[PDB]
């Protein structure tokens, strides 16, 4: 329930081989306002798929 030996710099970074965040690299431009947005999300100004939805 507790370690017998302090793990190393090696094993601490080996565990964080999968802690690395994944960037999006998939921003989508809107066809009526040219805003980049998340795919299938509305824009910051409230356009979505060419239509003004939220305003």
């Amino acid at each position: 329930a507790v370690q017998q030996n302090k793990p190393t710099r090696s094993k601490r970074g080996m565990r964080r081989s999968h802690d690395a965040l994944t960037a999006v690299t998939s921003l989508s431009v809107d066809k009526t306002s040219g805003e980049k947005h998340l795919r299938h999300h509305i824009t910051a100004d409230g356009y979505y798929r060419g239509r003004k939805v939220i305003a």
Binding site: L38, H40, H41, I42, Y48, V53, I54
Partner: protein, 120 residues
């Protein structure tokens, strides 16, 4: 397991879950567009859309059915006198869901849900 089951529990007991959708169905009839989470929306679709199917036939026996599922007489009037005739020729799909991003306080995925006409 969970095979072929429906309904999100939403980390609520069944009474809180029933009272939360009674409120949230009331709010989608009031302002016709509300900003809720993405899993509380799509569960609101199973609540507010039978209310508009119910309001398509105006009768006393359905006005009290709508009142029993929406304990607010102002909602029952707008359902039957406004939203009923407005969705007369629509076969389902009275609401749409527009994902609007993430909540600041807890990173919850948010969405707008709104009636598909909104009459502007």
């Amino acid at each position: 397991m969970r095979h072929r089951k429906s309904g999100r529990q939403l980390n609520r007991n069944s009474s809180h879950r029933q009272a939360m959708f009674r409120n949230m169905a009331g709010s989608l009839v009031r302002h016709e567009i509300i900003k809720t989470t993405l899993p509380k929306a799509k569960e609101l679709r199973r609540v507010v859309e039978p209310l508009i199917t119910l309001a398509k036939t105006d009768s006393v026996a359905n006005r009290r059915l709508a009142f029993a599922r929406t304990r607010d007489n102002e909602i029952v009037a707008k359902l039957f006198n406004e939203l009923g005739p407005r969705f007369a020729s629509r076969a389902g799909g009275y609401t749409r869901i527009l994902k609007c991003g993430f909540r600041a306080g807890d990173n919850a995925p948010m969405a707008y849900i709104e009636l598909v006409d909104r009459s502007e």
